[PDB]
Amino acid sequence: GSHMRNVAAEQQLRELESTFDGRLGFVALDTATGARIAHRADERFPFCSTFKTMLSAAVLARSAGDAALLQRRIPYAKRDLVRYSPITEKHVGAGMTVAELCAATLQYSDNTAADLLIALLGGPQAVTAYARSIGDATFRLDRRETELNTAIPGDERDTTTPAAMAASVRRLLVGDALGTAQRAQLNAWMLGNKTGDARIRAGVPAGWRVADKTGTGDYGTGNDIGVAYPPDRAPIVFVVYTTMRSRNAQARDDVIASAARIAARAFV
């Protein structure tokens, strides 16, 4: 890549933001060199379901010290389900194992699976504590699903910054904070994500494998975080947060994909 291309990419992110009635938070990191392409890197954004990556990492970290945890079954009933539970609704009664709940929350964004894992860890503050333990002094999880998606302007609950989340994704997916096996497992789950086809994945070449987690909420909030793995090249971290001025705006998959494409083309 080049410094000149990175600067030009940051200008194209400004131009992209001018095209819609909201704001764009963006960090992409080329881990070959640490080079960065950013827009609003240090502003807070409502992270919505992208926190499910941090949640799952916290569960994996606890399993490193507990050989029974990943196969532990957590029963739940139909009345326990929260809105948008495509996988967990199929397994009411005996429930699912902790590993299955991680996979469900990561790959389908299942909200009951998330709530079960937040509760297992001891509540939202345990997820914030895990983030602090991997060097993220910015991330905060305050509420559970689905209230954490309110995305009210000026509200700092359930927010992070693009820069903080890009460093955490890099540490979790590319570095070895989970230990080599846990790291591989988190990557595999996010590589098998079913909800991201129109977001970062739509902006990168077909040969780049993307481990990502999406988020969607009120105020047209549309997010995607993860790591792209070009073949035989260092990984590239992508964090894309967008949120709109109107409470009932639609999320914009095309803007997320465009922002990713700007950085993929600048780095490649």
Ligand X SMILES: CC(C)(O/N=C(\C(=O)NCB(O)O)c1csc(N)n1)C(=O)O
- 84 in contact with ligand X (CB under 6 A): yes
Subset of residues 216 to 235 that bind ligand X, contact rule: CB under 6 A: 216-218
**How far is Cα 14 from Cα 10, in angstroms, rounded to an integer?**
7
Decide: 144 and 132 in contact? Cβ < 8 Å. no
Q: Looking up tokens 């409502």, which residue turns up?
A: 46
Contacts of 216 (CB under 8 A, 6+ apart): 48, 49, 149, 222, 223, 251
Stretch that binds ligand X, among 12-20, 134-142, 215-223, 259-267 (CB under 6 A): 215-223
Question: Which residue has the closest beta carbon to ligand X?
Answer: 49
SS3 211: strand
The region of 7-15, 55-63, 140-148, 260-268 touching ligand X under the rule CB under 6 A is: 140-148
How near is the Cβ of 120 to ligand X at its closest, in Å? 18
- 49 touching ligand X, by CB under 6 A: yes
Whichever of 49 and 107 has its CB closer to ligand X, that residue is 49
Known catalytic residue: 49? yes
- Comparing CB distances to ligand X, the nearer of 85 and 185 is 85
Q: In terms of CB distance, is 217 or 235 closer to ligand X?
A: 217
Residues in Cβ contact with 242 at an 8 Å cutoff, skipping those fewer than 6 apart: 20, 22, 23, 24, 25, 45, 220, 221, 222, 223, 251, 252, 255, 256, 259
**In one letter, which amino acid is 60?**
L
In the set 2, 18, 49, 258, the catalytic residue is: 49
215 binds ligand X (CB under 6 A): yes
Rounded to the nearest whole angstrom, what is the least distance from the CB of residue 64 to ligand X in the complex? 26
**HSE on the CB side for 119, CA within 13 Å?**
13
Chain-centroid distance, C-alpha 26: 13
Q: Does 85 bind ligand X (CB under 6 A)?
A: no
Which chain residues interact with ligand X by CB under 6 A? 48-49, 84, 109, 111, 145-146, 148-149, 215-218
Q: Which residues carry out catalysis?
A: 49
